[PDB]
Design an enzyme around this catalytic site. Structure first.
Site, PDB file in Angstrom:
ATOM      1  N   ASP A 270      -7.401  -1.762   3.210  1.00 25.62           N
ATOM      2  CA  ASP A 270      -6.496  -2.890   3.111  1.00 25.62           C
ATOM      3  C   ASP A 270      -7.026  -4.113   3.844  1.00 25.62           C
ATOM      4  O   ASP A 270      -6.438  -5.192   3.713  1.00 25.62           O
ATOM      5  CB  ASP A 270      -5.116  -2.518   3.666  1.00 25.62           C
ATOM      6  CG  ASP A 270      -4.480  -1.363   2.921  1.00 25.62           C
ATOM      7  OD1 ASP A 270      -4.510  -1.371   1.673  1.00 25.62           O
ATOM      8  OD2 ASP A 270      -3.948  -0.447   3.584  1.00 25.62           O
TER       9      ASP A 270
ATOM     10  N   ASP B 218      -2.163  -0.390   5.979  1.00 24.67           N
ATOM     11  CA  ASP B 218      -2.465   0.322   7.216  1.00 24.67           C
ATOM     12  C   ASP B 218      -3.922   0.708   7.473  1.00 24.67           C
ATOM     13  O   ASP B 218      -4.394   0.595   8.608  1.00 24.67           O
ATOM     14  CB  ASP B 218      -1.627   1.604   7.268  1.00 24.67           C
ATOM     15  CG  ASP B 218      -2.053   2.624   6.225  1.00 24.67           C
ATOM     16  OD1 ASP B 218      -2.149   2.263   5.032  1.00 24.67           O
ATOM     17  OD2 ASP B 218      -2.308   3.787   6.605  1.00 24.67           O
TER      18      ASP B 218
ATOM     19  N   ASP C 270       0.869  -1.156   0.000  1.00 25.41           N
ATOM     20  CA  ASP C 270       0.000   0.000   0.000  1.00 25.41           C
ATOM     21  C   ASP C 270       0.936   1.244   0.000  1.00 25.41           C
ATOM     22  O   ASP C 270       2.096   1.158   0.508  1.00 25.41           O
ATOM     23  CB  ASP C 270      -0.973   0.051   1.188  1.00 25.41           C
ATOM     24  CG  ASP C 270      -1.789   1.315   1.356  1.00 25.41           C
ATOM     25  OD1 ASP C 270      -2.791   1.486   0.534  1.00 25.41           O
ATOM     26  OD2 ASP C 270      -1.587   2.198   2.217  1.00 25.41           O
TER      27      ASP C 270
HETATM   28 MG   LIG Z   1      -3.044   3.339   3.502  1.00 24.26          MG
END
Ligand SMILES: [Mg+2]
Ligand SMILES: *[C@@H]1O[C@H](CO[C@@H]2O[C@@H](C)[C@@H](O)[C@@H](O)[C@@H]2O)[C@@H](O[C@@H]2O[C@H](CO)[C@@H](O[C@@H]3O[C@H](CO[C@H]4O[C@H](CO)[C@@H](O)[C@H](O)[C@@H]4O)[C@@H](O)[C@H](O[C@H]4O[C@H](CO)[C@@H](O)[C@H](O)[C@@H]4O)[C@@H]3O)[C@H](O)[C@H]2NC(C)=O)[C@H](O)[C@H]1NC(C)=O
Ligand SMILES: CCCCCCCC/C=C\CCCCCCCC(=O)OC[C@H](COP(=O)(O)OCC[N+](C)(C)C)OC(=O)CCCCCCC/C=C\CCCCCCCC
Ligand SMILES: CCCCCCCC/C=C\CCCCCCCC(=O)OC[C@H](COP(=O)(O)OCC[N+](C)(C)C)OC(=O)CCCCCCC/C=C\CCCCCCCC
Ligand SMILES: CCCCCCCC/C=C\CCCCCCCC(=O)OC[C@H](COP(=O)(O)OCC[N+](C)(C)C)OC(=O)CCCCCCC/C=C\CCCCCCCC
Ligand SMILES: CCCCCCCC/C=C\CCCCCCCC(=O)OC[C@H](COP(=O)(O)OCC[N+](C)(C)C)OC(=O)CCCCCCC/C=C\CCCCCCCC
Ligand SMILES: CCCCCCCC/C=C\CCCCCCCC(=O)OC[C@H](COP(=O)(O)OCC[N+](C)(C)C)OC(=O)CCCCCCC/C=C\CCCCCCCC
Ligand SMILES: CCCCCCCC/C=C\CCCCCCCC(=O)OC[C@H](COP(=O)(O)OCC[N+](C)(C)C)OC(=O)CCCCCCC/C=C\CCCCCCCC
Ligand SMILES: CCCCCCCC/C=C\CCCCCCCC(=O)OC[C@H](COP(=O)(O)OCC[N+](C)(C)C)OC(=O)CCCCCCC/C=C\CCCCCCCC
Ligand SMILES: CCCCCCCC/C=C\CCCCCCCC(=O)OC[C@H](COP(=O)(O)OCC[N+](C)(C)C)OC(=O)CCCCCCC/C=C\CCCCCCCC
Ligand SMILES: *[C@@H]1O[C@H](CO)[C@@H](O[C@@H]2O[C@H](CO)[C@@H](O)[C@H](O)[C@H]2NC(C)=O)[C@H](O)[C@H]1NC(C)=O
Ligand SMILES: CC(C)CCC[C@@H](C)[C@H]1CC[C@H]2[C@@H]3CC=C4C[C@@H](O)CC[C@]4(C)[C@H]3CC[C@]12C
Ligand SMILES: CC(C)CCC[C@@H](C)[C@H]1CC[C@H]2[C@@H]3CC=C4C[C@@H](O)CC[C@]4(C)[C@H]3CC[C@]12C
Ligand SMILES: CC(C)CCC[C@@H](C)[C@H]1CC[C@H]2[C@@H]3CC=C4C[C@@H](O)CC[C@]4(C)[C@H]3CC[C@]12C
Ligand SMILES: [Mg+2]
Ligand SMILES: [Mg+2]
Lengths: 40, 294, 993
Positions: C691, C687, C346
């Site tokens: 996700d 995070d 990410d």
């Molecule tokens: Mg992120």
């Protein structure tokens, strides 16, 4: 020898066990020494 | 998967490899295992070269001799009916197997048998444990010595009318000299009468104090009429140096046995180089559970 | 819980009007709802709070650890042992209790292993519970025309809700009136900067429009109003969380390896049993006995300690990780990192820092770079020119943000600053290399400021000059570089001033495109000294008319800014690529920024090119170039929505540097699945909540600890409590190291198998006295052997592990036939021969020669034959011969330990030599010493021949296994030699594990 050959049928297992234990103990100690040698 | 890993036809493979591979692996394992076998055999041959043919290097696990008998009891119990004959067959068959080795036909000539004192005597040393002198000579032991239990008169040996016999025997040990207790003030009660120094005494009794009364008259038969083993049949020089050797035997008749009741009879030998064990119930003594149920 | 309706991309009613909205849910735009109506709805559908997770009782996860694949094998083994005992009890009198002991022991082993594994997962759960800090929150709702602050759990659909900069958006709102309101859509949509929320509609995609506020978002600056459109679990992040919980778990690679291992162990076990069953029936034995033989051989081929050894082995590697701040919730998730071959990462919050920072600065016709790293570990920018000082005064003065009260403790970069992200970044840079801005600001009093205007496109202000020799007035202004460029005529070069000729104007244009192409946002700063003769110290410049010269200013220099990446991000990405791990960027951010961050972290190696780059370098349309000449590709989310399965397969099959931009969480999940469809292991590092569906379906999820969301933190498998990205490299290294160690330990515990079974086989086929008892096999498998096998984990690398390519899952397994050929075929055979050697020696020294032992078991076992003739003619009672058999068991066990010495040494290294690696492993040395001390203790301590049935040995016997051990050492040494000199030869494809 001859008639009184009684020793031909005796074995000092006692002394053998004593020594085998002394040795086992020593090996165990040495082991510990090597294991902790570095963390001091 | 299932079919391919078994046989594919493009690479001409079976199980995974080609024809020439299974051979490389099989040949390798054959040579490897062959070397392994040859090494193990060599290390076992040096061991055969380390031991002697006339004497066991270690004789401490057999120092106190055992006390076995002629009948083969499954749980050290002798139970049989005086009516049904197919009840004591297993006993007579064994007894017979044991006495069948003391047949006079077997003991004949000067070699290798020698006539010994008809009365208990002392030890006899036929030299050392060597091959210098040829096959040593062993004393003859006649059947008839055992009077009412010999299968020569009453083949059954007693079991036919409520009077069984029990042939006791001392375990054969190489270079073992039996030594009896001396005449000093400390000696069991039983042993005082008939102290033939040359005889190792055998005396049976009852395990419990109650059973005494229910056990009748223990009649022992042996060499010279004594209840023991003559010291002249020792020592034993081992199979290699004394094939055709016969060990003394002692017969015990349990006359006047109470009917329909389990009797615990413990037989015991007495002597210096004889010691019992609370774990091994056959070291020096032996137990029998007789029950003549009729 | 329909998953397909949850797998679909979000839909909405954004493209509507304020009248249509109020007409659909029912609501007064100026008076809101009524209290009675509000409660009627509150009770009609449920509070605006997400459903708690599905609680997991503690007794349930205990029963789980008691089962599995290995513990199940031990369970069936115990069951079989009790079955054979039952048969022996009902068929024969005086049944030995060997089988009942072995069964209770196996059950105890399974129970103990379960207790230990469960205790570890509980430890991690407790340290995990110490992070959920949930403070109640109350929203501002307008009912009956009045403003009231009620708990977040009492908001319903339809009422009016007002927000203010600093508060959190309660539910999904439909903005009706805003006043310069900005929101942080980083957790849900992944937008690094604050998107302004306007009542008007702008994009067909609800996540891109500005008329919708979202759940869990925060209003950075401004105030706004809105009608609650979505409430409770029905919200966007509610459907995402529910989808995350409604996903399966999977099955790690280490588990599949253990499963195939058990498959082989059972194959050879049932093979040896059914075969010796037909063989026993061919030699005369009865059925009743053959059944017991079958069960005995099957049980004997089961490793009781491999379970405890494997669990403790994995746990040791899990604590090394806990020492560097890498916590794993499960226990096998420690190996998945080493087997990974494609890492999907990410950008916002993972690859970057999600904090705006001053990156590049322009001054004295020269680009200067500033340190944009968390701990400030880098290069200064030459703070010795006067130009820089003037720049510091411009930025530090013409800026209205100030640190939040009470931050005197945190560092200069992590403190809270009230204001826009640009003024905050500037304030932090000035406070970083120019000292306290609060004094710099009080040192020059601000007289008049004209706020940023939508038409002026600039921010200016006049302040007094602290020069005690100059009482004039200072004027400063900042703004877009184009607008400010059109307002200057001088340039502060190295301190002095100079005209604005086209030479520097072009140098300014190239500088603008340089900072712009870098994906950064640039600003221009200029100032001017107002003549105190035309504007005295007493004249007041009210902000009404042209009191300051807009033009003729003095431009000092440009100032760029952008969100920088974390410290160890480039190095870690490079390390992963070096290990053959494909790095693919997956983020829901703007592609213009994603591509720049990709090139800056190593995903898009410098030099590679995209199809658009080629079309721009040649000046030809994009439909003409061939897509095979482009190594890296930027796939847009809008385009990803319209792509077939094969197309995605080809995208991953032909492009080595892929970057998925503007991808929704559902698309992230689709990408992870597209990677798995081929056959590679996947690790997703993220995070936020977007996700969560990606970390769950991936083979292994890595969530950030400080900057991560609670949902993604609870749905991940590995947590980075320090937010360090280098931990990924450490993990991929440890995952391999503990793998080669598992192989070594397995071969170790499997080599002893043979000298433990062969005795019984020769017992039934050759009719010789029993060689290896049951309490000895137990003293070997669960005693001595444990410490050495555990020590084999502490082995260091042989070659560089961070250099070889990732292991192939379809071909390189954990337990192959090459291992079985060694443990069961070559080493175990020698150990068995050594044991039989010591055996025959003990029986030959006491009187039983090897020629008379074949054919004696019937009388050697019989309990009523008190006259057994030996090779010399002696008569042995039953207990006397049994004592010797037991002493033979004791020496057999000691022989096993002696050969295990050389086995532990040849197992230490798989290829390298002992004289190279070295005996630097202190644990292994301790294992050997303890292994010997235990055997001596079990034999020489009084009362052992009573309790365990082990008699003392005579000092000459202990030396019967020494030659076999040295031979084992020499054979394996020459083995590990041809492999080195001859790479790829027979010894390698035949004996190289
Ligand atoms: Mg992120
Ligand atoms: C050691 O001595 C054993 C006894 O020796 C006998 O007595 C000594 C003192 C000498 O006089 C010697 O010459 C004697 O033979 C000797 O065992 C004997 O072997 C013979 C030959 O097989 C047996 O004779 C057979 O008897 C059976 C029936 O036996 C019944 O009694 C015995 C117990 O005595 C039971 O065990 C049986 O179950 C029976 O209940 C006859 O049926 C059989 O018939 C055969 O002979 C006739 C002619 O007579 C033929 O017409 C038939 O066709 C058969 O061929 C025999 O008559 C004798 O029973 C047996 N005695 C014992 C006590 O078992 C032993 O072999 C010697 N061992 C060595 C190593 O020297
Ligand atoms: C690098 C790794 C180092 C590891 C070191 C580990 C430390 C070893 C620790 C101890 C070992 C020493 C043991 C000594 C014990 C002697 C005790 C004793 O009194 O024992 C007598 C028995 C004879 O018994 P019996 O049956 O005849 O009488 C029985 C008579 N009753 C029963 C009637 C009484 O004898 C015995 O046990 C013999 C004892 C065994 C003899 C030791 C052989 C050493 C083998 C190889 C080492 C060679 C080193 C070479 C140097 C190279 C330098 C570069
Ligand atoms: C950080 C530093 C750490 C250092 C720690 C050091 C620890 C201390 C180290 C060594 C201590 C040595 C103790 C020696 C004891 C000798 C006992 C002994 O010789 O007894 C022998 C006799 C039994 O002979 P028997 O006639 O029945 O033989 C059988 C004959 N048949 C079968 C033929 C009839 O004893 C008897 O009668 C009476 C026995 C009474 C019970 C004694 C208990 C001994 C048991 C364990 C102690 C040993 C531990 C050593 C450490 C090992 C670590 C792994
Ligand atoms: C009293 C006397 C004492 C007796 C004691 C006996 C102790 C027993 C000792 C050892 C047990 C041996 C049992 C067999 C072990 C075979 C190992 C095995 O099955 O491992 C499994 C492997 C799988 O491996 P992977 O996962 O890497 O495959 C990957 C394939 N991918 C990647 C292409 C998909 O499958 C394979 O190897 C394929 C299967 C190959 C099976 C070969 C069978 C050979 C067995 C006997 C031969 C006897 C002939 C004797 C006559 C010689 C002529 C003179
Ligand atoms: C007839 C009887 C048959 C018996 C068969 C079974 C035998 C199995 C038992 C022992 C086998 C011993 C094999 C000896 C191997 C020695 C290898 C050696 O010496 O290689 C030298 C290494 C290499 O150094 P480098 O160049 O990489 O250093 C670089 C340093 N930098 C980085 C600073 C530059 O140096 C190092 O490993 C560092 C120093 C390590 C010193 C180890 C000494 C301990 C050795 C054995 C322990 C004894 C176990 C006894 C078990 C019995 C218990 C009763
Ligand atoms: C860093 C931490 C270091 C910690 C190291 C700890 C090391 C501990 C070292 C030594 C302690 C061991 C236990 C001591 C046992 C003393 C037993 C004892 O003194 O017995 C004496 C009497 C024997 O008398 P007697 O000769 O008249 O019998 C004649 C019998 N007739 C004639 C009928 C044959 O005993 C009897 O009677 C009955 C015998 C009772 C049997 C007890 C043996 C326990 C069995 C298994 C436990 C061993 C597990 C292994 C643990 C390893 C830990 C490392
Ligand atoms: C960290 C390093 C650890 C090292 C430790 C080594 C691990 C050991 C692993 C497995 C060994 C355990 C196997 C248990 C064996 C029990 C044997 C048993 O129950 O035999 C029953 C015998 C009956 O015999 P009989 O019929 O001939 O009697 C005839 C009596 N007439 C004739 C006079 C009437 O009764 C007797 O011996 C009565 C005396 C009872 C003796 C119980 C001894 C229990 C020993 C160990 C259990 C605790 C171990 C826990 C440590 C785990 C380590 C991970
Ligand atoms: C009954 C007969 C008794 C005989 C006793 C003899 C004792 C000899 C004492 C020490 C041996 C000499 C020291 C060896 C030092 C060699 C140093 C060295 O530079 O080594 C390197 C070579 C490997 O080169 P490479 O090209 O493969 O490297 C490839 C590297 N890459 C893969 C990165 C390309 O290493 C090698 O050749 C290592 C191969 C050595 C194999 C010989 C094993 C000898 C057997 C036992 C030794 C005694 C220990 C146990 C003590 C028991 C006491 C009772
Ligand atoms: C008490 C316990 C005692 C145990 C003692 C055990 C001693 C027995 C040791 C070895 C005997 C086995 C020799 C087998 C020779 C026939 C094997 C054969 O037919 O092989 C053919 C290949 C040549 O084909 P290629 O690779 O060119 O074709 C390429 C084909 N493709 C692609 C499949 C690779 O052969 C090659 O590669 C060459 C490889 C040859 C194998 C070398 C192994 C040496 C291992 C140990 C010797 C050390 C003994 C030390 C003992 C000291 C005692 C004190
Ligand atoms: C054998 O035992 C019997 C008892 O079973 C003894 O004979 C008994 O003697 C008592 C007198 O003490 C009489 O009252 C019984 O009538 C007798 N019973 C029988 C069956 O005769 C006998 O004396 C014992 N004989 C020997 C030699 O011990
Ligand atoms: C590294 C290598 C070469 C070391 C080999 C050490 C061997 C020889 C050592 C380890 C343990 C030792 C045994 C430990 C205990 C006893 C019992 C004692 O009553 C006689 C000696 C005896 C039997 C020892 C003989 C030597 C021995 C077997
Ligand atoms: C290093 C390896 C391959 C050597 C193996 C050597 C083998 C073949 C040697 C070692 C010891 C040898 C044995 C030694 C003693 C005897 C006794 C004799 O009456 C017949 C031959 C016989 C049985 C030998 C046969 C061959 C033998 C087993
Ligand atoms: C006690 C004696 C007679 C048993 C001898 C058993 C031998 C023949 C057995 C034990 C282990 C077996 C090997 C085990 C594993 C493999 C690997 C496989 O890919 C080919 C077969 C091969 C190489 C086997 C061949 C047969 C083998 C060597
Ligand atoms: Mg998971
Ligand atoms: Mg085992």
């Amino acid at each position: 020898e001859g008639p009184d050959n009684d020793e031909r049928f005796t074995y000092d297992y006692y002394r053998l066990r004593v020594v085998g234990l002394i040795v086992a103990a020593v090996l165990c100690v040495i082991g510990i020494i090597i294991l902790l040698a570095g963390k001091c | 998967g299932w079919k391919k890993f078994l046989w594919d036809s493009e690479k001409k493979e079976f199980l995974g490899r080609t024809g020439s591979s299974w051979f490389k692996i099989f040949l390798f394992y054959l040579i490897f295992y062959g070397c392994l076998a040859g090494i193990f055999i060599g290390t076992i041959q040096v061991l055969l070269l380390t031991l002697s043919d006339f004497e066991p290097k270690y004789q401490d696990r057999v120092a106190p001799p055992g006390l076995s008998h002629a009948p083969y009891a499954i749980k050290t119990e002798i139970s049989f009916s005086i009516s049904n004959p197919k009840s004591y067959e297993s006993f007579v068959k064994s007894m017979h197997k044991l006495m069948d080795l003391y047949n006079e036909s077997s003991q004949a000539g000067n070699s290798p048998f020698e006539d010994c004192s008809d009365t208990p005597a002392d030890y006899i040393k036929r030299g050392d444990l060597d091959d210098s002198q040829g096959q040593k000579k062993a004393c003859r032991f006649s059947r008839m010595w055992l009077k009412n239990c010999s299968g020569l008169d009453d083949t059954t040996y007693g079991y036919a009318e409520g009077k069984p016999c029990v042939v006791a025997k001392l375990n054969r040990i190489i270079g073992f000299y039996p030594k009896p207790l001396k005449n000093t003030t400390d000696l069991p009660e039983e042993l005082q009468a008939n102290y033939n120094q040359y005889v190792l005494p055998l005396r049976c009794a009852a395990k419990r104090e109650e059973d005494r009364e229910k056990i009748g008259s223990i009649e022992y038969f042996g060499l010279g009429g004594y209840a023991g083993f003559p010291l002249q049949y020792y020592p034993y020089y081992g199979k290699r140096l004394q094939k055709k050797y016969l060990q003394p035997l002692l017969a015990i008749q349990f006359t006047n046995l109470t009917q329909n009741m389990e009797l615990r009879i413990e037989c015991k030998v007495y002597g210096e180089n004889i010691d019992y064990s609370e774990k091994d119930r056959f070291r020096g003594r032996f137990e029998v559970k007789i029950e003549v149920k009729s | 819980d329909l998953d397909e309706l949850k797998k679909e991309v979000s839909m909405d009613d954004h493209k509507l009007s304020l009248d249509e909205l109020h007409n659909k849910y029912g609501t007064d735009l100026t008076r809101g709802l009524t209290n009675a109506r509000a409660k009627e709805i509150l009770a009609r559908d449920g509070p605006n709070s997400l459903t708690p997770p599905p609680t997991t009782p503690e007794w349930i996860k205990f029963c789980r650890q008691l089962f599995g694949g290995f513990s199940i094998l031990l369970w069936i083994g115990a069951i079989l042992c009790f079955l054979a005992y039952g048969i022996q009890a009902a068929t024969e009198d005086e049944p030995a209790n060997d089988n009942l002991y072995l069964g209770v022991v196996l059950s105890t082993v399974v129970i103990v292993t379960g207790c230990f594994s469960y205790y570890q997962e509980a430890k991690s759960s407790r340290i995990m519970d110490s992070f959920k800090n949930m403070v109640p929150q109350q929203a501002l709702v307008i009912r009956d025309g009045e403003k009231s602050t009620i708990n977040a759990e009492f908001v319903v659909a339809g009422d009016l809700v007002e927000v203010k900069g600093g508060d959190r958006i309660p539910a999904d709102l439909r903005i009706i009136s805003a006043h310069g309101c900005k929101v942080d859509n980083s957790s849900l949509t992944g937008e690094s900067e604050p998107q302004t929320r306007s009542p008007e509609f702008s994009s067909e995609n609800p996540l891109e429009t500005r008329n919708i506020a979202f759940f869990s978002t925060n209003c950075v600056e401004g105030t706004a109003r809105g009608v609650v459109v979505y409430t409770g679990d029905r919200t966007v992040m509610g459907r995402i969380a529910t989808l995350a919980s409604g996903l399966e778990v999977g099955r790690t690679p280490i588990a599949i390896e253990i499963e195939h291992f058990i498959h082989i162990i059972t194959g050879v076990a049932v093979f040896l049993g059914v075969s010796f069953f037909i063989l026993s029936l061919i030699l005369g034995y009865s059925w009743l006995e053959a059944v017991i033989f079958l069960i005995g051989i099957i049980v004997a081929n089961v490793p009781e300690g491999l379970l405890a050894t494997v669990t403790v082995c994995l746990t040791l590697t899990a604590k090394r990780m806990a020492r560097k701040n890498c916590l794993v919730k499960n226990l096998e998730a420690v190996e998945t990192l080493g087997s990974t071959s494609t890492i999907c990462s990410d950008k916002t919050g993972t690859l970057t820092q999600n904090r705006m920072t001053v990156a590049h600065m322009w001054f004295d016709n020269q680009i200067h770079e500033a340190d944009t790293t968390e701990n400030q570990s880098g290069a200064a920018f030459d703070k010795t020119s006067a130009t820089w000082s003037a720049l510091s005064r411009i930025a530090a003065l013409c800026n209205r943000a100030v640190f939040q009260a009470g931050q005197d403790n945190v560092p200069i970069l992590k403190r809270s600053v009230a204001g826009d992200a640009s003024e905050s970044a500037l304030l932090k840079c000035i406070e970083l290399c120019c000292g306290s801005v609060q004094g710099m600001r009080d040192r020059n009093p601000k007289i008049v400021e004209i706020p940023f205007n939508s038409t002026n496109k600039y921010q200016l202000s006049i302040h007094e000059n602290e020069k005690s020799s100059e009482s004039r007035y200072l004027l400063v202004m900042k703004g877009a570089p184009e607008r400010i460029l059109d307002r200057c005529s001088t340039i502060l070069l190295n301190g002095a001033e100079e005209p604005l000729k086209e030479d520097m104007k072009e140098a300014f244009q190239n500088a603008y495109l340089e900072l712009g192409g870098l994906g950064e946002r640039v600003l221009g700063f200029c100032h001017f000294a107002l003549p105190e003769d035309k504007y005295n110290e007493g004249y007041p410049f009210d902000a009404d008319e042209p009191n300051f010269p807009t033009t003729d200013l003095c431009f000092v220099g440009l100032m760029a800014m952008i969100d920088p990446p974390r410290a160890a991000v480039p190095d870690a990405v490079g390390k992963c690529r070096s290990a053959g791990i494909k790095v693919i960027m997956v983020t829901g951010d703007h592609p213009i920024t994603a591509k720049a961050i990709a090139k800056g972290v190593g995903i898009i190696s410098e030099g590679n090119e995209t199809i658009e780059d080629i079309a721009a370098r040649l000046n030809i349309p994009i439909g003409q170039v061939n897509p095979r000449d482009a190594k890296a590709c930027v796939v847009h989310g809008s385009d990803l929505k319209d792509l077939s399965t094969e197309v995605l397969d080809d995208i991953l099959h032909y492009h080595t540097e892929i970057v998925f931009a503007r991808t929704s969480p559902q698309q992230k999940l689709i990408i992870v699945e597209g990677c798995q469809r081929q056959g590679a292991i996947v690790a997703v590092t993220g995070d936020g909540v977007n996700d969560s569906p990606a970390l769950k379906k991936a083979d292994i999820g890595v969530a950030m600890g400080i900057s991560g969301s609670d949902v993604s933190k609870q749905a991940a498998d590995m947590i980075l409590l320090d937010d360090n990205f280098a931990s990924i490299v450490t993990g991929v290294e440890e995952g391999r190291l503990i793998f080669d160690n598992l192989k070594k330990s397995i071969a170790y515990t499997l080599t002893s198998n043979i000298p433990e079974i062969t005795p019984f086989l020769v017992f039934i086929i050759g009719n010789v006295p029993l060689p290896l008892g049951t309490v000895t096999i137990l003293c070997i498998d669960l005693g001595t052997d444990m410490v050495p096998a555990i020590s084999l984990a502490y082995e260091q690398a042989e070659s560089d592990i961070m250099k070889r390519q990732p292991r192939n899952p379809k071909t390189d397994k954990l337990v192959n036939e090459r291992l079985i050929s060694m443990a069961y075929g070559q080493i175990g055979m020698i150990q068995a021969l050594g044991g039989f050697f010591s055996y025959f020696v003990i029986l030959a020294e006491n009187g039983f020669l090897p020629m008379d032992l074949i054919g004696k078991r019937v009388r050697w076992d019989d309990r009523w034959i008190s006259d057994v003739e030996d090779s010399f003619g002696q008569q042995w009672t039953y207990e006397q011969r049994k004592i010797v058999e037991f002493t033979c068991h004791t020496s057999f066990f000691i022989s096993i330990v002696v050969v295990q010495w050389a086995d532990l040494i040849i197992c230490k290294t798989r290829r390298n030599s002992i004289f190279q690696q070295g005996m630097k492993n202190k644990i292994l040395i301790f294992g050997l010493f303890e292994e010997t001390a235990l055997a001596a203790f079990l034999s020489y301590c009084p009362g052992t021949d009573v309790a365990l049935r082990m008699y003392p040995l005579k000092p000459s016997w202990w030396f019967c296994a020494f030659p076999y051990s040295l031979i084992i050492f020499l054979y394996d040494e020459m083995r590990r030699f041809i492999i080195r000199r001859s790479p790829g030869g027979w010894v390698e494809q035949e004996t190289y594990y």
